[PDB]
From Swiss-Prot:
Protein name stated in the entry: Neural cell adhesion molecule 1
Posttranslational modification: Polysialylation modulates cell interactions by confering both attractive and repulsive properties that are highly regulated by ST8SIA2 and ST8SIA4. Polysialylation is formed on a-2,3-linked sialic acid of core glycans.
Subunit text: (Microbial infection) Interacts with rabies virus glycoprotein. (Microbial infection) Interacts with Zika virus envelope protein E.
Residue ranges constituting the Fibronectin type-III domain according to the UniProt record: 6-97
Function: This protein is a cell adhesion molecule involved in neuron-neuron adhesion, neurite fasciculation, outgrowth of neurites, etc.
Organism: Homo sapiens
Length: 103
């Protein structure tokens, strides 16, 4: 267990949820550390929405698609990886869409 370094923070490309009420954030797809990731945990909150505690994902998930979040208002997302020996540093991003205005 000792030579296993913890995983690196998850990757974030901020791929806009054109789908509406949702968004796509990239996920680790390889062994960043000393052992592969086991699970992923995502926590997010919006201006009008609660801090969802965890969105589960398995090690073999290239991305995570979140939903039940504000789209016409601002929201924040935190995501971490959990490998068989420890956890990754959190990565976080903030987003809002549908902010088009007449010009």
């Amino acid at each position: 267990m000792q030579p296993v370094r913890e995983p690196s923070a998850p990757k974030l490309e901020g791929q806009m949820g054109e789908d509406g009420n949702s968004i796509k954030v990239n996920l680790i797809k390889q062994d960043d550390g000393g052992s592969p990731i086991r699970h992923y945990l995502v926590r997010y909150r919006a201006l009008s929405s609660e801090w969802k505690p965890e969105i589960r994902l398995p090690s073999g998930s290239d991305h995570v698609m979140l939903k039940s979040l504000d789209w016409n208002a601002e929201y924040e997302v935190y995501v971490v990886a959990e490998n068989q020996q420890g956890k990754s540093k959190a990565a976080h991003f903030v987003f809002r869409t549908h902010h088009h205005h007449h010009h």
